[model samples]
Target: MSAIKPDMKIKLRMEGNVNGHHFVIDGDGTGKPFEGKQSMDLEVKEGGPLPFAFDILTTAFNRVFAKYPDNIQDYFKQSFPKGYSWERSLTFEDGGICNARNDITMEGDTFYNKVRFYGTNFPANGPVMQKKTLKWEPSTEKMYVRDGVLTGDVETALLLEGNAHYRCDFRTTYKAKEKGVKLPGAHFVDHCIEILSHDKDYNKVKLYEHAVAHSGLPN
Candidate 1:
């Protein structure tokens, strides 16, 4: 990671696997965005305000798309920030791109956002971010939330590669905008939610907490 630069343009070719799924977060941000699909069952836990979610998501992309173009990848930094909504035009290898759109809401003239990632791979139409919802009750002795962060032992269960359950302890952090501060080339945003390290050991699990959720157990 490097200091974020506004004019940074990324145009590279790369390939790798994260959490048993192969992907290409490659391109010049022109002809296509990230494209890679494999059968995967896992957990993705996100806790925070809608603004926080957007901030974290865009920030994550800013990290990934540091020096990229503005083809199908400008939704976060450009579209969503200005428009009341956004969508991801995911370009697949088989030569088809799916539109995963974001749904929006309003309350007393204030806006709220939801980042929904939905699509199909493996020839079966379903969600890529689907998860089995579960109660969040990590032991306080081992896990505690303080200073906008959750620390200590965390457990998750899921099925991956057609067999077995996965479990792990992960940490979550929140980054909030300053009370009376301004940012350069950045707008007033909400707190950001960040989950660390779970992607590294995604395939290892013990028992599925909710066996019905065969897609992925998102806690």
Candidate 2:
């Protein structure tokens, strides 16, 4: 008989909006609808800040965009710090890209960050660079909705439990900018971390944490 193997897991949580049933971390800067849906919780574990993990994610999405003009592929190096900070652009709701650092923090497999998209066009577009220097920088392709999606053979440690296979889903919510932040009418601006993995992560605990959320769950 085969020995029992421990399953790889993820930890989910939220920084700005924790009361909601599901939360979203921008997969692509574009306002395109979330391709990922149907998430469940695992259990928060031990981990640390993985700035490189964020860099890797951006690189994954940027790879396809890099294939075309803009030499998008080469920009992966630009997104991360040569030795210090990884430079990245958080897409604005109004089709502009804001160059910012994805200051990273972690809680076990679950990580939180301030690298979020700003503007009113969320959950649904496209983007551009804000600064003159990054005005024409390459970026990812438009977002889409689909299933059985495969970015490549790279395995998702959190979703694939032990020898078991699983899927996850998340929703997005942004807070109105408080007084000290972006200019008034600028819409709230602060970034969020991606749910790289989860175990009791903010996203869910059981299948219906989000699924049954609309089925008479407590407010």
Candidate 3:
């Protein structure tokens, strides 16, 4: 009982090589065409080679937004007519669950965002409990692309129990054009934590993680 009607059919044919191994992908047949009412959406599921594809996409979009800061208001007005919000409960490799949520809204020409994270028994240094609430607006500067790679850094104040701060550096490199490419691209996130006054013995910590994701077309 959907309002949209299917009025199009299309076929796809792709061929690519990876690690000296060539492969070709062809849709069923001309008669067995795929039908849809709108443009196709990229679907990358979990457990795939690029499990962190979403993070790559997010970084790409952020780069675009930073490059065109003037158009951000119009972009959000069209893309998120009713605002945007999302929540997720993630289980870490060490069997710890972390709950997080983010909400974004626009007022006039300015955009606002809030992120909340709550968890217990997290594997940070050891089994530790943590909770954080962050409020900040998107920065239109300090982001650029160099040699087909995009990089940016953002620092924010945290609303934790102690006087703390957080900063993250994100980078995404494109390597789809390289021959025998096992990974089309890779994304990295570097985290830095600073606490000026805390009850704990430590006052600063740094951690980072990187993951490869498929770019261009999937083979």
- For each of the candidates, the C-alpha root-mean-square deviation to the true structure, in angstroms, is 19.3, 20.1, 19.2
lDDT of 3 by residue, 164-193 (tens): 433323222222222332321222222222
List TM-scores for all candidates, in order.
0.22, 0.20, 0.27
Top candidate (lDDT):
3
Error of 2 at 43 (Å): 6.1
lDDT of 1 by residue, 1-219 (tens): 212223222232222222233332222221111211111122333221111111112111221122223222222223222223333344333232233333333332222333333233322231123332122222211223355332222233223234533332323222222232111221111112222222332321111111010111232
lDDT, residue 52, model 3: 15
Total clashing residue pairs per candidate?
10, 30, 0
Q: Per-residue lDDT of 60-156 in model 2, one digit per residue for the tens?
A: 1211111112211222112222211123333432332223233433233222234422222222211111111111112112211123211111112
Better candidate number, 1 or 2, judged by TM-score: 1
Which candidate model has the greater lDDT, 2 or 3?
3
Using alpha carbons, what is the TM-score of model 2?
A: 0.20
Q: For model 3, which pairs clash?
A: none
